[PDB]
Enzyme design. Structure first.
Site, short mmCIF file in Angstrom:
data_model
loop_
_atom_site.label_atom_id
_atom_site.label_comp_id
_atom_site.label_asym_id
_atom_site.label_seq_id
_atom_site.Cartn_x
_atom_site.Cartn_y
_atom_site.Cartn_z
N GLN D 11 -1.61 -1.02 44.52
CA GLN D 11 -1.26 -2.26 45.53
C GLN D 11 -2.08 -3.47 45.77
OE1 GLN D 11 0.88 -4.51 46.95
NE2 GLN D 11 2.07 -2.88 47.89
N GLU D 245 -23.47 -10.71 29.15
CA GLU D 245 -24.73 -11.18 29.65
C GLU D 245 -24.90 -10.44 31.05
OE1 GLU D 245 -27.55 -12.78 29.41
OE2 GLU D 245 -27.24 -13.80 27.38
#
Ligand SMILES: Nc1nc2c(ncn2[C@@H]2O[C@H](COP(=O)(O)OP(=O)(O)OP(=O)(O)O)[C@@H](O)[C@H]2O)c(=O)[nH]1
Ligand SMILES: Nc1nc2c(ncn2[C@@H]2O[C@H](COP(=O)(O)OP(=O)(O)OP(=O)(O)O)[C@@H](O)[C@H]2O)c(=O)[nH]1
Ligand SMILES: Nc1nc2c(ncn2[C@@H]2O[C@H](COP(=O)(O)OP(=O)(O)O)[C@@H](O)[C@H]2O)c(=O)[nH]1
Ligand SMILES: Nc1nc2c(ncn2[C@@H]2O[C@H](COP(=O)(O)OP(=O)(O)O)[C@@H](O)[C@H]2O)c(=O)[nH]1
Ligand SMILES: [Mg+2]
Ligand SMILES: [Mg+2]
Lengths: 427, 90, 430, 429, 427
Positions: D11, D245
């Protein structure tokens, strides 16, 4: 006056020659209607090699279109440059081969090949002197493989003193357009070794890699593939259709490239292939033309030149060129990598110069290579054949037309003999 | 009945312009310019950026020395020129 | 010239044919009256001035389905003597369809193929439609293929046949009629295509997203499968495949000719906009078991040979790339003696959407016909239920009363028994 | 091409997602029907002619949240079969979404993931969005993360998880669900960005000066944070920092991958005019002790690694002046074995503004992701609450009946206990 | 006939390289189209050292672009002078190292080195006589550092007799752009101490200092960093591209600067830099370059030259300059600061005069310095590497793909061996 009679066989053979007569007429300047519109006298000087003069300035090619399915003659007629052919040369049948070599060679071949030889002997006896026959087909199918090899074996009995230049589209290692590709190829190569004087091996997977790596073409259709092979077929006969500094016709390359009669299969490449983006960056010079000539990816056969030694290779240079870079670059490719060349032939590579370039392009060259690295192409199809033949897969259809099991063994026996002969001189 | 072949995305029909030298083109409009599976003409969108946004400043005019034919600071690192007291006349 | 004769036996044959000849008029612009306002020679013969009559026959013992063609919107299209009727139906009795009330109609039938045979120049094959679940489709279907074999030898009679599903069946006596009709189907039909209703029910539920499909919605996508594989004869393409191309490339052994079927973009209207339909994507979705026309798992078997018929804007490189992706994948397993497992067929015309239908307008579609070793699991299913009822000798007095003796059931059982060893022998490595 | 598949579980996951795709369609100019009037290729896929469908699935066992997307203004944006529903919810039970109920959906969801993985040319990573307080976010999130490790091995996945708050809670058995879901987060998520609702409530109270913030105000700024780190995939910058990265610069040890998050310029419309947004002060606001989205005190902890994502008209020199000013400040702390702590990322495009949202147009932005030892105090409160209810078997009979036996709680208690010992040893000097 | 092959690696190399040909081309007078538009005949005299001839009068850079992300090739090609490079030299991968040195060196670098060696080998054979290779990259990253250092190893085995010109920026003392910059730099320096012939050490905050103190710019952008490097990079090759009274080429600088084979890390600066307001008031003559040449505030390295004595020096003066003023100013800085020069090498400074200045500037010079003060930069990286490695932090991202801790101890050992031999030459 060295005439070549052209025959197209099968679905692939009709389509490759449809783009072939489109290119060679564009070089000579004939419009799709049939008249002449070139701007040079040298274009019309040698038109007898591929065209017959007719009343009113019309030119008709020495082309015979043959197949068994009338769909492809609808394809070549509705396509551009499809009205130039003689309507009498449209000889074919209605049954359709159905990609069966036995049907293409034995059952319907009896009724078809009687009418086709009447058209071919009409084309040959019309011209004063014959140079040879340029046929185009494929080895994976049955409409041009079985029917073509029936024609080639029959036409060499009638004309044994004239050469036979055949173009074959061999099956792919990675993919397969037909399920019975090893059955069609191994029977066709069994017929091509003793009838065809030399063969130029073509295949789509090498053309597909060229269309994506060098040409960088987004959507390579079969019309895109047909132009690459057709650009070669103009370049092989460039010394015939045009005067040249060092002339090399279709018999010049035959004695130079072929050491032994069984070894007459070539790997072929067209040199100045550039992408549309890289037209301005690449400077058309001979030394950079030679490195693209000897690049493994630029070869239009899937056999990798790095695996086997070259027996004899030939180059057909076209354009206003001087003949040290014709010779020094072919000398430099020997000394740079001498292991890749056969030791008992001094100066394996070969070259010749025609001073008439193709339309709109400054320098061009066509490369013919007879290397022993093509054995794995025949080894793989022989490997694919023996796997199917042991289980007798897809053979109840072939034996239906009247091919006994003995002929399949004899075809495979010639493949092992031919692949061993290439390995004999590789050591 | 010859239905139409699939049209090319960029109007290429016979590759005569590709194989022959007619109609040279930009390095775009190709399949790949990297290694593989890269669209050359379709890359990262380019914002205006600080160098183009903050006036005309590029180092070509400072390096080429075209002034003979502004300063960030004068003297101390803190202050900037042309910002000071209001000049008063009479 | 190329032309195929379509033959539709039984209520299953006619209802597919109503959906079939609905479709064939759309690619050629034929109105229901029959007036075009020249690729129609495969299915239509130019009669008189501006009128086309279908190259078909609608034969059925039950008159209640052939008169619906006569009273329907396609009254003027079909020739009236072309449609064949009968006084009484077979009532799902193979003995009635083959011996008692089948011989008086088949004499009238063979005079009607013969007149279509003389009208047409060079015949490519016969497209026969039947269902083995009913006595009309089995009994008259078994008779009709036998008579075409002795009259038109070595002509490729390419068949589409509906088989009983395991979970859902519409008649009790289906296993008796399926085994009896298959015994005639081995020795007669050159190429047969396997169809099963419940797999298409899953297809309508999952892909097309229809909660309650009807028999009309089933045959609409079935007719797309028929039209796609025959579209190569009608319209030119890059790599055309004929009817004779299929039999010499997808039948490894003369009794192993039971090829599966699958279709690609079975996609509804609103689903088409959001779907990125590419050649690589539609080839992967073709080989999924969800897109299979028959409820049999292909993962249990090995693909002996598969044929792909592409329609629309298919560049030949992308179908060449899609061959490599499927064979490299470990889940799709081929038999060890067939490295060249695929055939590609590219046609240039996209499929034509039926107006009011559930399918959407799609640029590209693939008809996946595959010869596998998983068909034997279907025939092991039918062999088991046939032995269950035959042990107590149930529903046999209907058959032996109407002409047959007891011996035909045992010989049909043994002939079908040798099929599952043949499918096991061809699948086992060596 | 660079491209990431962002998936949303539970939800809280979907309500983040439609808040996210509100910002994504405005950022690339995509209209809600999917028609544009190449930066979209990271998240959207080109479809036919002028249609752009997100590379996103919306899975939840409860269909009440999913059909809101099917009914609302973005009904034409999403492919319908991307949105996956369920028959009954896990209903705040870890074992229901992990063993009993979630097994009927995890086979359907991973099939849809493979179709998006086949459509994508070169995949860059995954973005999972789940809340560990509920059963569907925890259980089905853990089950799907199990399959993602074995299907696409060594491939980056980003975990945006909303952990329970110390004070605020909308759940009772959430110490059970957070502990059991954390055991899956140690072994499978490569990079997990922590989030907490209470710290976002403080951000909206004092900075966005809204005293009545609802869930759609919380998830809009969360949408800004996820869009900030992924913006290097879409737009070029001075110093691009893509998804890969983040692993090699913020994860020193393989079992330490929980990171805080901060978004520096958080101001209203009338507050933006008077204030001066400068790069020197926006970094101080980024490292401001109340600016984080996780309720932690980094003064209690120590920064192990930091990543800065500068957006807008940020020159490459005042950002290095800003980084230099932080290291000289004695209030902030960095661990002794990591001298090179910061990572700088500069982009060239200002953040977009939603119409009707609380945020105003800003020329500069900083998204700060830091790995600290202050995240160890989240689990210490989480272990303290979990040990209380497991002391005399509270709320266990709901977990025993649906598959999971009593042994998984002892394993989850011990593995999280080893995580606490992992946190204290790495902060040792 | 002394050609230079340029290779640009990663985010640092491509952005520096994009602005590098900004300064090379307009100095030679090349439009972004690629043709010639200059007026001086001396510009056309030596172009082949950096450019190749193309058909149509175009001049194409002799550059090779390499990366692991498609982001930077889109950045370089979109900028000005972005269409001059060949589409063939844009070779890279789609993965991205992510500052992981072993990803660029072992796993994701293995499939690309064979691809980028082909374009290096093709470019070297095209030119008649190599002068050297010119690589620009970083040491804090992983794409230009990892795959760059493997390229140095590969290019040195193939051509061991040619110069190597590495333009490597180093991780900063002050701030950190990548967290793992001590790990990647120490592994890259260990791969540079043997194979690289000469290394020109640059730092970003030395560039930050000169652009804010000397240039006096309010908001200097990211291209301000690149333009100061490009004036230096063209300043080394000044005697090659143009004639001069005293010629000094890339090997001529290398022999006079490198006393021992591991002393090949240089700090380089640029002389004629001034602010906008100081332009009218300075008298640009020979001596005023020299006082700004040797000043440490104009230096472009992190190390302060005042700490360590100068081993060898260099000066590449450009313009119509009097040699005696190049003479007497050279000796003037030696005697004024005699403590900063090595005793056992008399006449440490090297000088050279080229008569063709950069575009628009009257007088110019470039100073290349080899000093023992550069050990403080290497000690900083070695100290930062030893602090992380003792707790094995950030190491599973390196050891996970095929590395053990053995060469980390080796790279630390060669680092401390390098800084010990700098220190003993200081004594
Ligand atoms: N695909 C498809 N299958 C159908 C359709 N209608 C009937 N069938 C199947 O066909 C089976 C019976 O086929 P038939 O032999 O044609 O039935 P019939 O012609 O009425 O034979 P009798 O009942 O004996 O008169 C049924 O069990 C159905 O499963 C249809 O419209 N589409
Ligand atoms: N940030 C944020 N968190 C939310 C939001 N809505 C709910 N949450 C969090 O979600 C937790 C509730 O668990 P959920 O995972 O959402 O429950 P669920 O997804 O419905 O799963 P089931 O209860 O099993 O059906 C609460 O503790 C909240 O902190 C939201 O809109 N934004
Ligand atoms: N280059 C090219 N190859 C084609 C074309 N059409 C078919 N082929 C090739 O021919 C092979 C199939 O052979 P086929 O046409 O069936 O031979 P046939 O039996 O003589 O008609 C496939 O591998 C195709 O790649 C075409 O237009 N151009
Ligand atoms: N001088 C200069 N330095 C740069 C440039 N681009 C990046 N850097 C430096 O390089 C370091 C980061 O390099 P990185 O982006 O990781 O290179 P990569 O390995 O290819 O990814 C930073 O410390 C920057 O200071 C540039 O264009 N010029
Ligand atoms: Mg009936
Ligand atoms: Mg000299």
């Amino acid at each position: 006056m060295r005439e070549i009679v052209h025959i197209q066989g099968g679905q692939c053979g009709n389509q490759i020659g449809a783009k072939f007569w489109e290119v060679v007429s564009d070089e000579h300047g004939i419009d799709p209607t049939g008249t002449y519109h070139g701007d040079s006298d040298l274009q019309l000087e040698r038109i007898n090699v591929y065209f017959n003069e007719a009343t009113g300035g019309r030119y008709v090619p020495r082309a015979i279109l043959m197949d068994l399915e009338p769909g492809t003659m609808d394809s070549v007629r509705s396509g551009p440059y499809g009205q130039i052919f003689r309507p009498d040369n449209f000889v074919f049948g209605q049954t359709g081969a159905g990609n069966n070599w036995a049907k293409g060679h034995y059952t319907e071949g009896a009724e078809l090949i009687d009418s086709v030889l009447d058209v071919v002997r009409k084309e040959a006896e019309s011209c004063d002197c014959l140079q040879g026959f340029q046929v185009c087909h494929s080895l994976g199918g049955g409409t041009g493989s079985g029917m073509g090899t029936l024609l080639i074996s029959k036409i060499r009995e009638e004309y044994p003193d004239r050469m036979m230049l055949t173009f074959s589209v061999v099956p792919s290692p990675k993919v397969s357009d037909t399920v019975v590709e090893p059955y069609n190829a191994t029977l066709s190569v069994h017929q091509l070794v003793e009838n065809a004087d030399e063969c130029m091996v073509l295949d789509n997977e090498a053309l597909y890699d060229i269309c994506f790596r060098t040409l960088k073409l987004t959507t390579p259709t079969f019309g895109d593939l047909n132009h690459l092979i057709s650009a070669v077929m103009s370049g092989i006969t460039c010394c015939l259709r045009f005067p040249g500094q060092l002339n090399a016709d279709l018999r010049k390359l035959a004695v130079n490239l072929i050491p032994f009669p069984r070894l007459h299969f070539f790997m072929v490449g067209f040199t100045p292939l550039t992408s549309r983006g890289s037209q301005q960056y690449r400077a058309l010079t001979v030394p950079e033309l030679t490195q693209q000539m000897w690049d493994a990816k630029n070869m239009m056969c899937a056999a990798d030149p790095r695996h086997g030694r070259y027996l004899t290779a030939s180059a057909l240079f076209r354009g206003r060129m001087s003949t040290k870079e014709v010779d020094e670059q072919m000398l430099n490719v020997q000394n740079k990598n001498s292991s890749y060349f056969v030791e008992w032939i001094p100066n394996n590579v070969k070259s010749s110069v025609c001073d008439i370039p193709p339309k709109g392009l400054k320098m061009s060259a066509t490369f013919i290579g007879n290397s022993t690295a093509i054995q794995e192409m025949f080894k793989r199809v022989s490997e694919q054949f023996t796997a199917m033949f042991r289980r007798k897969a897809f053979l109840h259809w072939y034996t239906g037309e009247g091919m006994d099991e003995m002929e399949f063994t004899e075809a495979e026996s010639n493949m092992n003999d031919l692949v061993s002969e290439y390995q004999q001189y590789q050591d | 009945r010859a239905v139409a072949p699939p049209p090319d995305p960029k109007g290429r029909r016979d590759l005569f312009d590709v194989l022959h030298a007619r109609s040279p083109g930009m390095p775009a409009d190709d399949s790949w310019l990297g290694h593989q599976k890269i669209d050359p003409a379709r890359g990262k969108a380019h914002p205006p950026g600080p160098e183009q946004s903050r006036g005309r400043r590029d180092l070509t005019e400072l390096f080429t020395m075209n002034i003979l034919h502004g300063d960030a600071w004068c003297g101390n690192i803190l202050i900037d020129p042309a910002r000071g007291k209001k000049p008063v006349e009479d | 010239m190329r032309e195929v004769i379509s033959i539709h036996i039984g209520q299953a044959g006619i209802q597919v044919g109503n959906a079939c000849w609905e479709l064939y008029c759309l690619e050629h612009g034929i109105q229901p009256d029959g007036q075009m306002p020249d690729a129609f020679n495969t299915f239509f013969s130019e009669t008189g001035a501006g009128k086309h009559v279908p190259r078909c026959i609608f034969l059925d013992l039950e008159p209640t389905v052939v008169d619906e063609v006569r009273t329907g919107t396609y009254r003027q299209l079909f020739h009236p003597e072309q449609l064949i009727s009968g006084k009484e139906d077979a009532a799902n009795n193979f003995a009635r369809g083959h011996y008692t009330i089948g011989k008086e109609i088949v004499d009238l039938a063979l005079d009607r193929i013969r007149k279509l045979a003389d009208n047409c120049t060079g015949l490519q094959g016969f497209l026969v439609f039947n269902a083995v679940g009913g006595g009309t489709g089995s009994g008259l279907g078994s008779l009709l293929l036998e008579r075409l074999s002795v009259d038109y030898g070595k002509k490729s009679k390419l068949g589409f046949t509906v088989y009983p599903s395991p979970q859902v069946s519409t008649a009790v006596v289906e296993p008796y009629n399926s085994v009896l009709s298959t015994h005639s189907l081995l020795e007669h039909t050159d190429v047969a295509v396997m169809l099963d209703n419940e797999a298409i029910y899953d297809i309508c539920r999952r892909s097309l997203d229809i909660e309650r499909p009807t028999y009309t919605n089933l045959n609409r996508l079935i007719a797309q499968v028929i039209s796609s594989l025959t579209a190569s004869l009608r319209f030119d393409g890059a790599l055309n495949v004929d009817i004779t191309e299929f039999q010499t490339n997808l039948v490894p052994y003369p009794r192993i000719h039971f090829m599966l079927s699958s279709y690609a973009p079975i996609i509804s209207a609103e689903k088409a906009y959001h779907e990125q339909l590419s050649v690589a994507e539609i080839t992967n979705a073709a080989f999924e078991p969800a897109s299979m026309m028959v409820k049999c798992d292909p993962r249990h078997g090995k693909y002996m040979a598969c044929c792909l018929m592409y329609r629309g804007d298919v560049v030949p490189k992308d179908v060449n790339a899609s061959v490599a992706t499927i064979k490299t994948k470990r889940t799709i397993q081929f038999v060890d003696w067939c490295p060249t497992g695929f055939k590609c067929g590219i046609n240039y015309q996209p499929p034509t959407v039926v107006p009011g239908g559930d399918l959407a307008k799609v640029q590209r579609a693939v008809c996946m016909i595959s010869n596998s070793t998983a068909i034997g699991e279907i025939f092991s299913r039918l062999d088991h239920k046939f032995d269950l009822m035959y042990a107590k000798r149930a529903f046999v007095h209907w058959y032996v009363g109407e002409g047959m003796e007891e011996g035909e059931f045992s010989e049909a059982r043994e002939d079908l028994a040798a099929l599952e060893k043949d499918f096991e022998e061809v699948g086992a490595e060596s």
